[PDB]
Subunit: 168 residues, 12 copies
């Protein structure tokens, strides 16, 4: 439970850095589960929109792996251990595996819209906790939050009507 | 008048997103009018500083078109319509056409200094409204605001005396 | 009404250059309204063909902005003022705003097919006027005309049946 | 009928190289007919999946032209003549012209799935013959075989159901 | 015989576009037979000028494949079917297969000089027909014609005496 | 247990492809657990060899993610589902989580040497099974196997004595 | 006087090609004298606009050297000798040396405006002669003519008043 | 003492901009002293970790020079003088010269850890002052602050034990 | 004589790895002697085919140095010492120095054809030994073997008659 | 005073290397003060030549930082300490701070002309001392000397009359 | 006759700089006549070595134009006028026009060998004069001299026998 | 013994060029033995500094191969034979094979420090001989000498104490 480090970034108290490390450790499991899950969707989409969807996920895979790197190294700068192994991720995460195997591209985009709502709400909660402890970490998380919301918009636009309502 | 959307980014209430969409819709007209107006200046500057000024505007044209893209796609992620047609821009804008045709480069930089003061003050007002609704949109607008102020500094430096006063 | 310049390109009479400047000034409003309108479509397309259409417009936006630059600088070389501000564009243009807001990608491609027929016919009329005044301007416009017709073909191919007929 | 060369790669008997040259001469007609046929599909696909399919074929055109180059130069290193003219291809091939003209993108992907099954089975037969004569040629053909099967998977994924069955 | 399309480029009558489609369909067979034939020469040249000739053909292969792409897509924009399969090419062409197998590089350049005279004269005839129907297609063909004549000059320069006469 | 697909690559029987899919599904969990574990080591190495080790893992992370992509897409071409989610990986894997948190770089290289021996032996077993079913899949796995053994050599070289013995 | 070649481009009569060779031989002296003269200006401009002018000439030097290459190789394809030595240029040219040594940048731009009027009028005369003999050569010269006129516009813009009149 | 400018960025009062100019003038001396000091360390590190440390500083030198450029130009946009000369830096700074000459790489990393704690605490103090005056300057400084803390983490990781404690 | 290592790649017995190390140690002397000998030819070719031959060897020098690197590092991964010094190469090699000094390009290509037959036969013998010990090493050597045979084909093509016979 | 090192470059006596180290230590302070001073000018130039001057300094900043790196590493190879901290630079230098704050671009170029005369004369004196001790160091300094004189020429050209006299 | 400048590079007396300006003015005519003459050869070589020779001259054209730029700008830094117009070149040069029009590639290489002997001897004489006046100019000319001699070696190697004698 | 050539670079007497050829022939054996020996070290370094040392040698391998190319081609321009075969190198060299097989990275850097002292002293002796015969060759060797001494400094820095003394 106690992640207070032995040293942290100058200007931050160790006990406050331990609670920021705990916030970022769960956000790192979320980002690692999200890029594993985006590659799963990339491999297992079918149907007449295959190539478009398959190609559209690949730059988001790369962007999310970059976000996970930068959260992990911020954990390490704050004096903590960035836990990246999948047994830890599955033991500590607060959401279930993505549940779609092979499916049409539009069905996967519906399920990925729900994945991204969980991730965006987790990041928004983490921004608010980080803003009370360290503005440099808060700033890193706010830029990531906006990029994740914009890729959820590309997913949602495929499900959206001319009148601006979402199917899935 | 009412731009409340049917869905918006997770974590934001729809009525608050409608008023952020309205703020960003006017900032998008300002950014589109600004890159049209920078190309107009680029084409219609003359006199002995032509090539320097002509070349100096071109990367700002590109940067401002990128800013307009990112405001437009943030409107769409918030559930709104990014209106990009010039009849709408002219109907909804709260400033007049840039009024200089062919002129010396230093005369155009004087008039563009006034254009950028309007744009910078509009963006600063929009930062303050967005900061009450969504920190991710506020962050996007603050980085744009600083870039626009820095390009206004390149315009102003041409008009500035050794004692640090501005001509135009 | 009278756009006869004080100097023009060697070998061209000033009064003939004024009427070529008038032809190119309207073609420049058309090209500026077209790249504003292509970005509007890019931002406001939805439905299951979103990413494909959204991505397909972006290189045409860039190509049309390049065409507008080269018409504007040819106006300036002919001794005229390339008017690039949106109030002038809306005051002088001979067509209405693009009328589609958010819509499915296939609906926008129908409406953009009609936009491009207006632009292609305007450019073909301008080629024929320029060919009587200056072959160098005629040549610039003919290459632009073919590129615009080829991008209208990519729009039309989405609307076309196996038997070679167009829906919209 | 007899393609025994006057010299061949060190370590290979000339009569065995002549029969490998005959195997590779037909595989070269197949690869040349396939990249001509992929460009034909690229030009003549229509309907709402146009741009995605049109763009997806282009890197496979390039990859298949590279495969044909490398089979041809291996024929020449083995002491034979790589016949690349279309009258020879049509006289010696053991399959018919691709039979689809203009058609929807999904209809062309159905017919291209059948083209690729012929090509993949021809390459697998050629791998087994080359493996008895020269492991260096067998290795070249096995890497090509896998790349062709992976591009047939991109074609098939467009035709595949969520339960993993193929339409066409 | 009748290739009148159901739609064509704005400003062109359908019956005139059908006869331009027929002109460009044969020019596309010529360009496809030429890049197949240039690769054949590339693979089957021998003797002490091998590497120079072999390397010199490769950028012309790429340039001619680009010319075929642009004629094909202009056929499709004019409302026609760009026929790219080799059985159609051999059935409809008005010239014979290139007749040289393995040969010295200078012998192949002699035979390729004759191939290019046929192609250049076919393109010049097509420029004159296109100029009566559509200046945009005429312009595309004139630039291709000059590039093909310049690569025939590189072939001819190898066969030319100090006094400016051609051997083959 | 039964992964026989409804279609597979031409030339392969479906029941044999199901058992190859099962072999590759476990090799894909191994490659995904390995690149998650390499990033974990990258973030959590300390001590005087930090930067060298930290930098040396990064191209292997990229190479292993590429290997996982190519195994996954080969599963999909063979007619199977490439399972990429971490709950499935942890449920189906036949090895335990990497057990080192923060540690000196040389301690992590000792533990990663043991990880790579498991991965290399799993890949060598999979090469031998694939070689009985499909040479194209066997070839993909043999190239991956050699690359993984070469990166294990870079890990082992740090642990090796001048006399060629390994510490850890 | 007589430059009729022994061979020329297919489709052109030799006597007509000799007179086109004579037209292009003088246009090649003009383009070679122009890029020598642009480098002379680049080296010998002074005063407070030095760096801007000095930098602005360099891409035009490169563009004009490219124009000279393409006229020379078109002379050679037409069967003639592209004479590139400076004693021939000075013996055959119909204009005098550029007469400005070291001078302020604005004085050199005045004198270069007069150089470019001679070059543009020579090219326009050559376009009209080439259009009667060969459309492929006419097309090459028209694109060069427009590029030269656009760089003369950059020179003239430095000399131009807000009312659109030229000083020098 | 009084740095109130004659003009400043729109929306900021001049007296408040003078105190922000004073904050940023000292942060600019700190960033210039830091990149001079990083190059000093790069040149004067020795011992068995030489190349790793020497190479690791070079991208941070480049990043810190970029940070100094952007603080300086923000001073100039706010209406102030960015003082970059070393006599001013040494007269106005509030810290002493870096005191290590030639030394082992690990000794220099100990001393650079102390340099970076001073710089990070100075930047955090400047973020808090800028946040009361102008959010655009505050945002620039927060991103710089995080990058400096992350490079201090790379320095500290070399000094850190497996249990997460720092030596120097 | 005994090169059995203390450790080797997982899955390979040490005594079998020692005999593979001995096979690869001689193949590494052959590849190092070959790239030294290709540079010798590059420097010492003369006569009218100089530039073509001189340029054609340079990418093969680079490719052969890459082959030597990859054999050496495979020796090291198998637990052996990759001996790269020239006294060892000359003591252990089973062929004589290349014997041509300055000579015409065609004479050097004759002698290099004989060098490559020795190298290709040595590599084919090594493929067959490696295939009994380790498929990963066998695969590396088979790809190298084919590349070396293809560059011997470029050498032989210069010596080959139209009827497909070799001079030297 | 005594900088004789414990080792130096082979072939140089230690006492002679100590006096070369002293020469290069002062040339390194001069080059570091010059690139700090060029950035100061870049930030603090104003008036109608701003952008041209501002842009023209930036590649010289980069070139001078490269010169300082190469002098510093030559000091270290000669066995000395390259002192890079600003307190040492200000204590040991033999010239005063650059004295211009904000000023017009032409005023700064006058003062920078005087800075460069000091630097060029210091480098010429150092070339003559190095030529008596070590030709490799002399060669490095002569190339730097010429580059510095050429950038002083770009500064002086802005101040020079048509008759070749300098203002400032 | 008298080229003493009004200012020159620091450390050089004006009268000595005038005589160095005269040396470099003639070396600049030689380098400009040489790159005009290399392009002439490039355009007018024929026969079976055409492409090799034609391609081999092009990088030397670029290198010689760079040498002329750097001599010209060194003249300007020394206070002189770099005369670049062809009437001056022909009036002041001390050699005749290159005398070969269209000719076989080997005949042109013979004549270019004689051109380069004149240029190399002129540069060697200029190195010796510059070494008495200014080591920075001497150094620039020595590097150019070696590059010109190495390109003369590529020309001579085409004319050289196996016994090391030159034909032409 | 006698290497007087039949022709040499203009301005050099043949007998003096023969003795420069002999000097450069031995410097070429030294540079070829050095890049073979650097690759040997790269492959056979072990222990905890492996990756840093292994990576640090690779750009020096490339730089030394470039130095050998440029000495060889200067031998050929001087009229001599650049002998590149390893039997000649071992017969003519005046030093022994590098004697370290597998060893820790720091042991190899000790032995490579001694190799580089031999090479640097050989190059310094060759500079002094070349300076009496030809300044262009002397200049090439002086730049190589400095680069080799700087890479010996990177080797020595790993062996150096804080007080500036070398271990090995």
């Amino acid at each position: 439970a106690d992640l207070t480090p032995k040293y942290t970034v100058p200007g931050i108290e160790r006990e406050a850095a331990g609670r920021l490390i705990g916030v970022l450790r769960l956000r790192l499991h979320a980002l690692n589960d999200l890029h594993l899950t985006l590659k799963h969707v990339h491999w297992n989409v079918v149907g007449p929109h295959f190539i478009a969807v398959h190609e559209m996920i690949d730059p988001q895979v790369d962007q999310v792996r970059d976000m996970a790197d930068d959260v992990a190294e911020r954990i390490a700068a704050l004096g903590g251990v960035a836990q990246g192994t999948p047994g830890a991720l599955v033991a500590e995460r607060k959401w279930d595996d993505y549940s779609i195997g092979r499916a049409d591209a539009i069905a996967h985009l519906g399920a990925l819209d729900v994945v991204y709502t969980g991730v965006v709400e987790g990041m928004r909660a983490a921004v608010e906790e980080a803003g009370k402890i360290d503005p440099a970490t808060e700033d890193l998380l706010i830029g990531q939050l906006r990029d994740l919301e914009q890729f959820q918009w590309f997913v949602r636009a495929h499900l959206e009507s001319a009148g601006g309502a979402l199917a899935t």
